[model samples]
Target chain A: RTLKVQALWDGEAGVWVAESDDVPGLATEAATLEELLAKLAVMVPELLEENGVALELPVELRLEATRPLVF
Target chain B: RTLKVQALWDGEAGVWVAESDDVPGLATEAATLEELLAKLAVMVPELLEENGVALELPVELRLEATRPLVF
Candidate 1:
């Protein structure tokens, strides 16, 4: 199955905070979008198993990041 | 303005390749998402000016990544 992830930029934190309803208890933040995706790569499966979700190999993730613009 | 960016995971290159139609001449790949975003942070404006577009500071980027998962 494909999981949708959203990463919103946090100016105060100077990082991108990620969250998703697809995976239970999924919450994380990182300074970079790539690091966030890498973290989710492992966390997604682990959280799914902890929450007693069905097993699936090779899950697909669509990670979207929103950054603010300024002049 | 918000510029949409797409970074698709490439197993062959072992990296996430990024491209965007919002900013002309945007074609780059990085091993990490953060790095890719970092690169775009600078490249976007540079390329826009090079392409003879109006000047805008700190362009907003909606970076999206599609990754394959495995158990």
Candidate 2:
């Protein structure tokens, strides 16, 4: 299965926030990109199971992050 | 293989711009998120091959987009 994640960098909050419609209750934030990804690894699977979605192992993630470029 | 794509909305330009280190020469912009993704689907593999990178089919993409919220 391919899951698409939308992530955005909150400059004011200084964190990356992510959420996905594919996985129910999948909203999370972290200070670093890797950290956010790590959280996804666990949370995505758990949430899918919690929501009664049968999951396939090694699902693909389309993680899209958008951040501003300031000079 | 998993590829990470960074995308951001350019309000002034009114488009979504995307690029990635994972796939060299992969820079593109589109008016909509789906459009950008469609571009990636074609460009990513082509660029990888152009850069002498052997590609496997069905590669995973992590597309991250960031946009501003104004009230």
Candidate 3:
């Protein structure tokens, strides 16, 4: 089904990185949080397809409400 | 389907970290790679069940040959 999303800022790269723990190899970056989230919405499905993983019934997507700060 | 697995060494923590990109919230650590891999074998399946996700048919699991070094 749907994926669980999370975001972390890359201090070295100076960009926001978005990732889905549910979908394999689904990680991307954007300049802003809004952009990254939008990208993730599409990227998740694409990644599942690419990896030959099918989504199960009754999709349940969970995302952490707050942005995680990585020191 | 089976989850794709990967491993990286945590220099600061002085331990090996194993991760499964396909299974959400599946990460563990061990002193050695062998131990990490063995733990992952069990952890992956349990994670799927914990998240209410089912494995699809024809599991296509993949892992990189070399261990990744996170700098």
- Give the i-RMS of model 3 in Å: 19.2
Q: Which regions of candidate 2 are displaced past 4 Å?
A: A56-58, A67-71, B1-71
| Residue A13 displacement in candidate 3 (angstroms) | 45
DockQ of candidate 2, scored on C-alphas against the true complex (2 decimals)? 0.09
Best by DockQ: 1
Error of 2 at B23 (Å): 8.4
Sort all candidates by TM-score, best to worst: 1, 2, 3
Best by TM-score: 1
Tell me candidate 2's fraction of native contacts, as a decimal between 0 and 1: 0.13
Locate the minimum summed-lDDT window of 10 residues in model 2 chain A: A62-71
Q: Enumerate residue pairs that collide in model 2.
A: A63-B62, A63-B63, A64-B63, A64-B64, A64-B65, A65-B64, A65-B65, A66-B65, A66-B66
Residue-level lDDT of model 2, residues A1-71, one tens digit each, is 67877777688999878878787887799886656767777777777777887656556665665422111
* Higher-TM-score candidate of 1 and 2: 1
Task: Tell me the TM-score of model 3.
Answer: 0.40
Minimum summed lDDT over a 10-residue window in model 3 chain B is located at B62-71
Q: List the candidate numbers ranked by lDDT, top first.
A: 1, 2, 3
Candidate 3 lDDT over residue span A18-64, tens digit each: 66667688668877544665666566656767896766755543332
Residue B7 miss distance in model 3 (angstroms): 0.7
lDDT string, candidate 1, B1-71, tens digits: 67888988787989988878787888898898778878877777677778877645555778888777666
Q: Write the per-residue lDDT of candidate 1 for residues A1-71, one digit (tens) a residue.
A: 88888988888989988889788899898887768878988888788888977645567888988655443
Better of 1 and 3 by DockQ: 1
